[PDB]
Amino acid sequence: RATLPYGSWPSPISAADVARARLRLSFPTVAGDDVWWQETRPEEDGRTTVIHLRGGHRTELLQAPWDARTRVHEYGGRSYLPIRTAEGWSVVFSNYDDQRLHRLDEGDPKPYPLTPLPAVPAGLRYADYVLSPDGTEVWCVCEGHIAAPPEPAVTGIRRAIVAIPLDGRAAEDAGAIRELVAGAQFYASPAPSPGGGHLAWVQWNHPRMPWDGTEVRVAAVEDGRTVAPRTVKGGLKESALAPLWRDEESLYVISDWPGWWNIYQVGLHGESPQALYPAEEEFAGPLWQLGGMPYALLGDGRLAVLHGEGDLRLGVYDPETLDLVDLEVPYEHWATQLSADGTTVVGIGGGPDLPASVVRVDTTTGRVEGLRRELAELPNVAYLSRPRAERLDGPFGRPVHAYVFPPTNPEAAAPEGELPPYVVFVHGGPTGRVSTVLDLERVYFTSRGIGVIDVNYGGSTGYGRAYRERLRRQWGVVDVEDAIAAAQALVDGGIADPARLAIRGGSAGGWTTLAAITQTDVFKAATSYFGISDLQSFAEATHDFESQYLFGLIGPLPGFERAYEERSPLRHADRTACPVLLLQGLNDPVVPPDQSERFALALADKKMPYAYLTFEGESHGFRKAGTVVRSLEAELAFYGQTLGFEPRGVEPINLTV
């Protein structure tokens, strides 16, 4: 080996390597020997395309002009639906730029519209597509942006479950689109039943989020309309989602009635749900993106299921024997995006030393196949840091789960009496979690001598409903405390350099870093990727799906103004403890760039050292390889100058006053 001071290590993982590996493999589909999935191309302006795989030949359906990406809830999800047509496969998708739903026929390279042009630019949006029981229509969730009356301003949102005819009669007639279900503010997971005599969906309304409480409604279909609707499962304090028919007259749902997402079988009249296999393990996730299922039906009636406290692992339930048997597989964490036909299941799998990749399993033989991975340059296993799981002890004796990635490099070590700098990662979506799945973004630091700790703080999902509710009305308190607890535990344990600690985070993670900076002094450097700094202006400016989220994170708005004011870092810029690095996409519909720029102006006016980088043509979350390169090299160099080292291969940036 050699011996260099921590942080100065030389590493083969380059910022560009991390950028090129941000493929975003998502939403596989499987029909017979045909597989489909969704890939984002980071070196083509982050556009998303659909890929078809048969017999090892994998072909790209959407050439450069197109971009399969819906904007329902601004986060979208599955943007394509493969339709089986006489001698071939047609495919419908959502085109980013105009949000219209377009159709594409194998045998024709030019896709064509099926929905009208919106009144305002992307004011009609489609998602969670399903093929109607007789073909000849796509049933899907529709999101409508209402134009102010006579550059049309937008004054409201109208959502519905809607029927689009597959023959382009609606390309120039909105009167061809039919409202099947309407009346609630949020819809998801529309599910025609086997005979076609019923229709099921998930709906919820505004003060709530889909993980707070939902309703799975099923109604009969008569003369082509809905009749006799009914709730089969869920409520205000109960999140029930993913309707999956088992036969005519009976279906599967996932509900957290017992405090964990479990599987229930419910009928259409008798109010007596049967709990299949009740466990203290989550069987689903938070519904941030539409178009994904956590369970699938096999040709024989068994269920392919995802389950676990923490990482989701893949098993099979046998309703004939009531057993749940895990499939012997090298993948430790799966996304809630399964597809299945016959004995073949398909999904997105990964684990500690496996990056996310499209996987194909076979439930009779057990054969597992790896179809596509997020990165081909398979890095040397020596440079990959192995995640160590720890239960930090929180304030009232409450456990706080974390993952520790030590600085790992096989050709360097630190001098006699040095401790490594560490960065606390705050995972972004308040109601989400980080998994063990290999993330080159962490390796980029660990390989260079910088340790990482990724904290699934209170409010994180995946560890029970209670754990998730620990964050209610405590935002800017429970997350800050749990992050600080992680850093202080690493210091108390002789692991971390207490004078070189940083915090960084994404959307809510930027909120958490700014809250921590302005409430404590443990961290000596901070990076906020498009975080929130003032809560009221955020609630008033943000997009609809998250426009009353703060009512649960901080509190109901006609009433908690003083809390929105007191907790906002923007109001306390002078309490900022360390230099700050702000990163912002200029076309962000979730966190308007006002938050970052106003905070930056406040750190001036207080002669506090900051640096604020803006990127054009980038939305909420960085998609373009060049953007990731610029910001990641900036962040490494920034930690170098603020905390104390000279990182190979990047020169430091200007801090302002």
XYZ file of C-alpha atoms in Angstrom:
657
model
C 0.000 0.000 0.000
C 0.670 3.680 0.354
C -0.216 6.118 3.135
C -1.901 9.431 2.366
C -4.024 11.620 4.620
C -7.732 10.812 4.431
C -9.526 12.709 1.674
C -6.436 12.938 -0.547
C -6.734 9.337 -1.785
C -6.638 8.605 -5.562
C -9.656 6.777 -6.886
C -10.741 5.290 -10.238
C -14.415 6.266 -9.828
C -14.770 9.641 -11.525
C -17.629 12.071 -11.287
C -18.276 11.220 -14.943
C -18.450 7.516 -14.068
C -21.171 8.307 -11.521
C -23.021 10.511 -14.043
C -22.973 7.906 -16.795
C -24.409 5.274 -14.392
C -27.582 7.263 -13.630
C -29.771 5.194 -15.951
C -32.797 4.973 -13.659
C -33.809 1.425 -14.606
C -37.511 1.288 -13.830
C -40.895 -0.405 -14.508
C -40.162 -3.679 -16.316
C -42.949 -5.459 -18.169
C -42.991 -9.129 -19.200
C -45.245 -10.927 -21.696
C -44.085 -14.397 -22.648
C -40.511 -14.127 -23.889
C -40.814 -10.332 -24.459
C -39.463 -7.949 -21.819
C -39.747 -4.172 -21.718
C -38.277 -1.583 -19.369
C -37.637 2.125 -19.022
C -34.122 3.637 -19.248
C -32.965 7.215 -18.881
C -29.977 8.168 -21.043
C -27.873 10.650 -19.017
C -25.599 11.662 -21.914
C -28.583 12.515 -24.180
C -30.007 15.328 -22.005
C -31.491 12.881 -19.534
C -34.242 11.783 -21.892
C -36.098 8.566 -21.035
C -36.673 5.794 -23.599
C -38.377 2.390 -23.592
C -36.359 -0.742 -24.324
C -37.593 -4.033 -25.730
C -35.736 -7.291 -25.120
C -36.269 -10.592 -26.887
C -33.803 -13.450 -27.175
C -30.908 -11.256 -26.083
C -31.501 -8.600 -28.748
C -32.434 -5.347 -26.934
C -33.739 -2.509 -29.120
C -34.501 1.157 -28.372
C -38.047 2.160 -29.372
C -37.966 5.970 -28.860
C -35.284 7.801 -30.860
C -33.839 11.195 -29.883
C -36.803 13.653 -30.195
C -39.075 11.669 -27.830
C -39.027 11.240 -24.072
C -41.304 8.756 -22.279
C -42.009 10.609 -19.062
C -45.330 11.566 -17.561
C -45.766 14.472 -15.212
C -48.707 13.343 -13.106
C -47.855 14.352 -9.533
C -44.718 15.889 -11.148
C -42.930 12.637 -10.324
C -44.670 10.467 -12.899
C -43.576 6.841 -13.069
C -44.376 4.214 -15.677
C -44.604 6.155 -18.951
C -45.432 3.326 -21.348
C -47.852 0.466 -21.854
C -47.250 -2.378 -24.297
C -50.372 -3.366 -26.193
C -50.608 -6.681 -28.033
C -51.913 -6.205 -31.559
C -52.488 -8.668 -34.378
C -48.958 -9.572 -35.488
C -46.947 -7.313 -33.288
C -46.571 -5.071 -30.236
C -47.851 -1.508 -30.185
C -46.789 0.779 -27.321
C -48.418 3.892 -25.833
C -46.326 6.410 -23.904
C -46.332 9.908 -22.427
C -44.149 12.395 -24.274
C -42.414 14.748 -21.862
C -42.503 18.056 -23.787
C -46.263 18.146 -24.554
C -47.501 15.488 -22.068
C -49.777 14.044 -24.787
C -50.182 10.289 -24.908
C -48.636 8.968 -28.151
C -48.852 5.534 -29.832
C -46.093 3.588 -31.605
C -46.460 0.504 -33.813
C -43.683 -1.996 -34.466
C -43.424 -1.540 -38.215
C -43.763 2.269 -38.079
C -41.020 4.485 -36.597
C -43.248 7.560 -36.185
C -45.418 7.777 -33.050
C -48.720 9.641 -33.225
C -51.045 11.292 -30.696
C -54.184 9.916 -29.094
C -55.063 12.872 -26.799
C -55.728 16.529 -27.702
C -53.377 19.482 -27.315
C -53.793 20.956 -23.832
C -55.101 24.443 -23.129
C -52.003 25.354 -21.099
C -48.695 23.724 -22.209
C -48.660 20.428 -20.255
C -52.162 20.823 -18.786
C -53.295 17.295 -19.677
C -51.208 14.425 -18.276
C -51.662 10.645 -18.183
C -50.340 7.846 -15.983
C -50.820 4.343 -14.556
C -52.172 3.078 -17.934
C -54.257 -0.106 -18.240
C -55.767 -1.853 -21.229
C -59.526 -1.993 -21.040
C -61.218 -5.390 -20.714
C -62.076 -5.375 -24.472
C -59.055 -3.585 -25.901
C -60.081 -0.460 -27.791
C -59.301 1.815 -24.827
C -56.522 2.678 -22.417
C -57.833 3.394 -18.946
C -55.551 5.697 -17.052
C -55.260 8.464 -14.487
C -55.647 11.925 -16.004
C -54.395 15.135 -14.432
C -55.797 18.412 -15.788
C -54.386 21.914 -15.260
C -57.225 24.439 -15.362
C -56.514 27.632 -17.294
C -57.470 31.032 -15.954
C -60.160 32.745 -18.040
C -59.546 35.328 -20.864
C -49.575 32.419 -21.640
C -52.579 30.971 -19.754
C -52.116 31.022 -15.983
C -53.176 27.940 -13.999
C -55.712 28.258 -11.202
C -56.592 24.649 -10.295
C -56.194 20.901 -10.852
C -58.873 18.384 -11.941
C -58.086 14.647 -11.802
C -60.034 11.620 -13.031
C -59.809 8.012 -14.144
C -60.365 8.232 -17.863
C -60.801 6.148 -21.001
C -58.777 6.998 -24.123
C -59.693 5.340 -27.467
C -56.719 3.556 -29.102
C -57.532 4.837 -32.636
C -56.629 8.523 -32.228
C -60.197 9.779 -32.285
C -59.170 12.005 -29.386
C -56.091 13.500 -31.061
C -58.350 16.446 -31.938
C -61.460 15.904 -29.789
C -61.505 15.939 -25.995
C -65.112 14.787 -26.260
C -63.790 11.334 -27.149
C -62.125 10.993 -23.777
C -64.609 9.655 -21.217
C -64.563 10.293 -17.464
C -65.062 6.882 -15.880
C -64.319 7.751 -12.243
C -64.219 11.332 -11.021
C -64.864 13.240 -7.840
C -61.772 12.881 -5.733
C -58.533 14.809 -5.878
C -56.139 11.869 -6.260
C -56.575 8.582 -8.132
C -54.239 5.639 -8.679
C -54.001 1.961 -9.644
C -57.124 1.453 -11.817
C -57.792 -2.276 -12.153
C -60.379 -3.866 -14.457
C -61.575 -7.153 -13.071
C -61.340 -10.505 -14.900
C -64.844 -10.642 -16.309
C -64.876 -6.900 -16.891
C -67.911 -6.597 -14.622
C -66.059 -4.594 -12.026
C -63.495 -1.821 -11.779
C -61.275 -1.070 -8.809
C -59.052 1.872 -7.969
C -57.397 3.823 -5.156
C -58.565 7.337 -4.306
C -57.693 9.874 -1.631
C -58.171 13.546 -0.740
C -56.029 16.423 0.022
C -55.051 16.977 3.667
C -53.723 13.403 3.443
C -51.009 11.642 1.501
C -51.514 8.161 0.044
C -49.424 6.675 2.904
C -51.569 8.435 5.508
C -54.938 7.064 4.445
C -56.487 5.849 1.186
C -59.580 4.075 -0.093
C -59.677 1.073 -2.401
C -63.022 1.451 -4.141
C -64.588 -1.151 -6.420
C -67.716 -0.633 -8.476
C -69.697 -2.693 -10.921
C -69.635 -1.782 -14.585
C -73.053 -1.646 -16.259
C -73.829 -0.172 -19.673
C -70.223 1.036 -19.652
C -70.501 3.294 -16.608
C -69.779 2.755 -12.945
C -72.468 1.608 -10.506
C -72.792 0.756 -6.818
C -69.320 1.872 -5.705
C -68.076 0.667 -2.370
C -65.024 0.786 -0.157
C -63.445 -2.624 0.253
C -60.488 -1.470 2.339
C -58.806 1.619 3.812
C -59.704 4.878 5.512
C -58.475 8.197 6.906
C -55.889 6.692 9.259
C -55.400 3.611 6.997
C -53.337 3.305 3.837
C -54.674 0.615 1.495
C -53.419 0.380 -2.059
C -52.631 -1.900 -5.070
C -55.930 -3.655 -5.932
C -55.096 -7.020 -7.546
C -58.009 -9.183 -8.624
C -57.944 -12.866 -7.682
C -61.051 -13.824 -9.629
C -64.443 -12.427 -10.381
C -65.906 -11.418 -7.037
C -62.616 -11.265 -5.011
C -59.329 -9.343 -4.806
C -56.075 -8.736 -2.979
C -55.157 -5.433 -1.351
C -52.260 -4.148 0.702
C -53.304 -2.282 3.836
C -51.542 -1.212 7.022
C -54.568 -2.019 9.236
C -52.204 -3.756 11.763
C -49.436 -1.115 11.663
C -47.534 -2.692 8.751
C -48.404 -2.967 5.081
C -49.879 -6.524 4.887
C -51.851 -8.506 2.304
C -55.595 -8.890 2.671
C -58.047 -10.831 0.548
C -61.409 -9.059 0.356
C -64.719 -9.783 -1.321
C -67.281 -7.490 -2.808
C -69.990 -7.644 -0.129
C -69.024 -9.424 3.079
C -67.210 -7.121 5.458
C -64.797 -9.847 6.633
C -61.317 -9.434 5.126
C -58.941 -12.339 5.569
C -55.399 -11.436 6.537
C -53.125 -13.646 4.509
C -49.739 -14.112 6.156
C -49.638 -11.280 8.778
C -46.081 -10.215 9.574
C -44.285 -7.285 11.214
C -42.838 -6.527 7.794
C -43.769 -3.958 5.142
C -45.306 -5.510 1.988
C -45.342 -2.245 -0.040
C -43.878 1.265 -0.173
C -44.842 4.939 -0.134
C -46.733 5.883 -3.311
C -44.507 8.573 -4.824
C -44.665 7.254 -8.411
C -47.590 5.703 -10.251
C -47.489 2.577 -12.402
C -45.768 0.114 -10.013
C -47.103 -2.994 -8.214
C -45.400 -4.684 -5.253
C -47.052 -8.066 -5.971
C -47.824 -10.081 -9.077
C -49.932 -13.098 -9.978
C -48.359 -16.190 -11.413
C -50.116 -18.411 -13.913
C -50.901 -20.955 -11.186
C -52.403 -18.625 -8.576
C -49.404 -18.176 -6.291
C -48.321 -14.604 -5.512
C -44.911 -13.048 -6.194
C -44.465 -10.665 -3.284
C -42.021 -8.165 -1.835
C -41.599 -8.021 1.882
C -39.354 -7.012 4.761
C -38.460 -4.644 7.592
C -35.876 -2.526 5.791
C -34.833 -3.855 2.362
C -37.616 -5.529 0.367
C -36.856 -9.137 -0.577
C -38.665 -11.358 -3.074
C -40.785 -14.346 -2.078
C -43.718 -16.454 -3.243
C -46.964 -17.077 -1.358
C -48.844 -20.324 -1.999
C -52.554 -19.816 -1.164
C -52.981 -23.609 -1.266
C -50.503 -24.101 1.591
C -50.533 -20.635 3.263
C -46.728 -20.552 3.187
C -44.505 -17.636 2.157
C -41.179 -18.900 0.768
C -38.321 -16.587 -0.158
C -36.672 -17.264 -3.494
C -32.992 -18.132 -3.179
C -31.572 -15.048 -4.904
C -28.472 -12.823 -4.729
C -30.602 -9.662 -4.607
C -31.269 -8.106 -1.220
C -33.501 -5.184 -2.180
C -36.159 -4.898 -4.866
C -38.177 -1.954 -6.047
C -41.965 -2.129 -5.841
C -42.093 -2.633 -9.591
C -42.872 -6.253 -10.355
C -44.319 -7.816 -13.467
C -45.110 -11.470 -14.009
C -46.376 -13.865 -16.653
C -46.777 -17.584 -16.061
C -43.816 -18.665 -13.975
C -41.619 -15.718 -14.954
C -41.266 -12.696 -12.673
C -39.393 -9.523 -13.640
C -38.222 -6.612 -11.531
C -35.504 -4.212 -10.445
C -33.100 -5.805 -8.006
C -29.908 -4.895 -6.238
C -27.955 -5.208 -3.072
C -24.790 -4.295 -1.202
C -22.438 -5.256 -4.043
C -24.957 -5.333 -6.895
C -26.199 -2.090 -8.458
C -29.804 -1.794 -9.519
C -30.503 -3.963 -12.550
C -33.359 -5.609 -14.469
C -33.719 -9.189 -13.225
C -35.725 -12.148 -14.540
C -36.628 -15.005 -12.165
C -38.412 -18.300 -12.835
C -40.562 -19.596 -9.975
C -40.310 -23.289 -10.833
C -36.602 -23.809 -11.532
C -35.314 -20.824 -9.584
C -33.219 -19.617 -12.511
C -32.178 -15.948 -12.132
C -30.949 -13.823 -15.062
C -29.461 -10.334 -15.191
C -30.764 -8.492 -18.245
C -29.440 -4.908 -17.835
C -27.406 -3.098 -15.142
C -27.022 0.593 -14.348
C -23.269 0.377 -14.957
C -21.112 -1.809 -17.206
C -17.750 -0.641 -15.873
C -17.898 -3.208 -13.071
C -15.542 -1.487 -10.582
C -12.962 -3.388 -8.617
C -14.649 -4.862 -5.535
C -11.795 -3.481 -3.408
C -12.949 0.119 -3.975
C -16.592 -0.669 -3.063
C -17.289 0.089 0.598
C -19.453 -2.487 2.403
C -22.434 -0.992 4.288
C -22.605 -1.677 8.030
C -26.065 -1.368 9.581
C -26.363 0.346 12.973
C -29.200 1.252 15.349
C -28.276 4.676 16.674
C -29.801 5.385 20.084
C -32.129 8.372 19.717
C -33.537 10.886 22.215
C -36.198 9.015 24.229
C -34.392 5.732 23.874
C -35.917 5.592 20.406
C -33.977 3.579 17.779
C -32.769 5.382 14.670
C -31.635 3.178 11.818
C -28.528 4.029 9.786
C -26.014 2.597 7.302
C -22.266 3.305 7.699
C -19.950 3.169 4.696
C -16.350 3.308 5.881
C -13.612 4.846 3.728
C -12.478 1.927 1.568
C -9.503 1.791 -0.831
C -7.029 -1.093 -1.303
C -4.009 1.073 -2.278
C -3.887 3.758 0.463
C -4.283 4.265 4.210
C -4.088 7.103 6.666
C -1.204 8.197 8.931
C -0.663 7.268 12.583
C -3.095 9.552 14.373
C -5.670 10.695 11.808
C -9.412 10.175 11.787
C -11.381 10.357 8.521
C -13.799 13.105 7.561
C -17.398 11.923 7.427
C -20.482 13.157 5.645
C -23.994 12.485 6.900
C -26.365 11.844 4.010
C -29.965 12.809 4.648
C -32.165 10.856 2.252
C -34.422 13.209 0.479
C -38.099 12.353 0.346
C -39.191 12.825 3.956
C -41.355 9.665 3.718
C -38.869 7.336 2.065
C -35.674 5.429 2.797
C -32.202 4.599 1.517
C -31.325 0.988 0.771
C -28.163 -1.042 0.721
C -28.175 -1.055 -3.091
C -24.783 -0.053 -4.448
C -24.658 3.674 -5.147
C -21.666 4.990 -7.036
C -22.392 8.382 -5.478
C -21.267 7.032 -2.080
C -18.337 5.096 -3.565
C -17.168 8.356 -5.140
C -16.489 9.581 -1.609
C -15.520 6.366 0.231
C -12.910 5.434 -2.386
C -11.317 8.887 -1.846
C -10.988 8.497 1.941
C -14.250 10.173 3.012
C -16.632 8.077 5.109
C -20.402 8.215 4.616
C -23.369 7.604 6.926
C -26.813 7.373 5.344
C -29.479 7.902 8.029
C -33.040 6.500 7.789
C -34.250 9.044 10.321
C -37.656 9.197 11.997
C -40.371 9.400 9.409
C -38.459 7.045 7.106
C -40.614 4.411 5.560
C -40.086 0.693 5.679
C -39.814 0.228 9.445
C -43.509 0.231 10.453
C -46.260 2.844 10.593
C -45.221 4.051 14.019
C -41.725 4.757 12.742
C -43.249 6.768 9.928
C -45.498 8.745 12.247
C -42.572 9.668 14.480
C -42.084 12.617 12.116
C -45.559 14.087 12.325
C -45.627 17.784 13.271
C -41.947 17.380 14.116
C -40.308 18.316 10.795
C -37.151 20.279 11.422
C -36.944 18.610 14.852
C -36.986 14.802 14.630
C -34.987 14.659 11.388
C -32.462 17.215 12.731
C -32.114 15.350 16.025
C -31.633 11.979 14.298
C -29.024 13.365 11.884
C -27.113 15.046 14.727
C -27.385 11.787 16.672
C -25.739 9.907 13.813
C -22.841 12.341 13.614
C -22.391 12.448 17.373
C -22.439 8.645 17.566
C -19.710 8.388 14.941
C -17.629 10.890 16.893
C -18.197 9.306 20.315
C -17.122 5.935 18.827
C -13.668 7.189 17.783
C -14.594 6.630 14.130
C -14.974 10.168 12.790
C -12.921 13.326 12.898
C -15.144 15.591 15.047
C -13.697 18.768 13.482
C -14.367 17.541 9.899
C -18.022 16.558 9.494
C -20.379 17.581 6.746
C -24.042 17.140 6.012
C -25.659 16.918 2.589
C -29.074 16.111 1.226
C -31.591 16.283 -1.587
C -35.069 17.780 -1.642
C -36.127 17.361 1.987
C -32.525 16.497 2.794
C -31.647 20.077 1.935
C -34.331 21.212 4.344
C -32.744 18.959 6.952
C -29.203 20.215 6.299
C -30.331 23.847 6.470
C -32.311 23.114 9.660
C -29.262 21.384 11.182
C -26.839 24.179 10.186
C -29.081 26.821 11.665
C -29.713 24.815 14.888
C -26.284 23.276 15.680
C -22.559 23.531 15.046
C -21.491 19.882 14.782
C -21.202 20.130 10.992
C -18.394 22.162 9.404
C -19.675 22.036 5.806
C -22.993 21.573 4.133
C -24.442 20.884 0.710
C -28.109 21.451 -0.123
C -29.332 20.020 -3.427
C -32.464 22.106 -4.160
C -33.715 22.193 -0.585
C -36.444 24.237 1.101
C -35.528 27.308 3.161
C -38.893 29.089 3.778
C -41.892 26.846 4.451
C -44.826 29.179 3.778
C -43.649 30.288 0.351
C -42.948 26.618 -0.383
C -46.455 25.516 0.500
C -47.925 28.366 -1.546
C -45.653 27.780 -4.565
C -45.153 24.013 -4.734
C -46.965 21.622 -6.961
C -50.301 20.146 -6.044
C -49.434 16.614 -4.852
C -47.301 18.117 -2.048
C -49.250 21.312 -1.419
C -50.652 20.233 2.008
C -47.855 17.869 3.007
C -46.609 20.430 5.514
C -49.963 20.165 7.352
C -48.698 16.842 8.641
C -45.016 17.626 8.820
C -45.462 20.918 10.675
C -49.197 21.427 11.026
C -52.496 22.618 9.568
C -52.025 25.922 7.933
C -54.891 28.160 9.036
C -53.176 28.081 12.433
C -49.480 27.140 12.445
C -48.058 30.227 10.689
C -45.838 31.011 13.677
C -44.322 27.532 13.444
C -43.744 27.797 9.693
C -41.918 31.044 10.438
C -39.902 29.867 13.426
C -38.714 26.634 11.856
C -37.650 28.150 8.480
C -33.842 28.499 8.119
C -34.250 31.540 5.836
C -35.425 33.552 8.832
C -32.286 32.525 10.794
C -29.583 32.824 8.123
C -27.252 34.456 10.665
C -27.367 31.309 12.831
C -25.734 29.400 9.928
C -22.766 27.561 11.385
C -20.647 26.638 8.374
C -20.026 27.479 4.714
C -22.910 26.412 2.500
C -23.050 25.003 -1.037
C -26.413 25.408 -2.781
C -27.323 23.524 -5.966
C -30.465 24.313 -7.943
C -32.180 23.205 -11.146
C -33.764 26.210 -12.875
C -36.878 24.379 -14.212
C -37.815 22.772 -10.880
C -41.627 22.483 -10.388
C -41.329 21.083 -6.844
C -38.909 23.389 -4.994
C -39.091 26.740 -6.842
C -35.581 28.199 -7.199
C -36.751 31.136 -5.024
C -35.859 29.029 -1.960
C -32.176 28.655 -2.892
C -31.684 32.183 -4.259
C -33.352 33.904 -1.295
C -31.254 31.861 1.122
C -28.162 32.788 -0.887
C -28.984 36.482 -0.685
C -29.516 36.047 3.064
C -26.103 34.412 3.516
C -24.844 37.544 1.917
C -26.180 40.490 3.882
C -24.660 38.463 6.706
C -21.168 38.224 5.202
C -21.538 34.367 5.482
C -19.482 32.317 2.957
C -21.668 30.470 0.424
C -21.569 29.238 -3.185
C -24.744 28.868 -5.334
C -24.724 26.923 -8.631
C -27.698 26.936 -11.022
C -28.305 24.573 -13.904
C -30.482 25.318 -16.947
C -32.769 22.694 -18.409
C -32.751 20.640 -15.222
C -35.922 19.857 -13.232
C -36.288 18.561 -9.645
C -33.407 16.131 -9.436
C -30.411 16.008 -11.731
C -30.803 13.973 -14.956
C -28.063 15.344 -17.234
C -24.583 13.811 -16.999
C -22.863 17.187 -17.296
C -24.879 18.603 -14.391
C -23.958 15.658 -12.147
C -20.300 16.046 -13.142
C -20.182 19.773 -12.360
C -21.975 19.510 -9.019
C -20.215 16.383 -7.762
C -16.737 17.723 -8.544
C -17.842 20.993 -6.889
C -19.007 19.201 -3.737
C -15.782 17.200 -3.347
C -13.620 20.287 -3.827
C -15.905 22.210 -1.445
C -15.445 19.653 1.341
C -11.732 19.903 0.639
C -11.624 23.636 1.280
C -14.110 23.816 4.147
C -13.068 20.724 6.152
C -9.362 20.463 5.506
C -7.843 18.338 2.741
C -6.570 18.419 -0.857
C -8.684 16.070 -2.991
C -7.008 14.694 -6.077
C -8.381 15.905 -9.390
C -10.501 18.979 -8.575
C -9.634 22.561 -7.855
C -11.576 24.547 -5.228
C -14.470 26.923 -5.926
C -15.070 30.553 -4.958
C -16.978 31.226 -1.757
C -18.752 34.583 -1.597
C -19.205 37.372 0.957
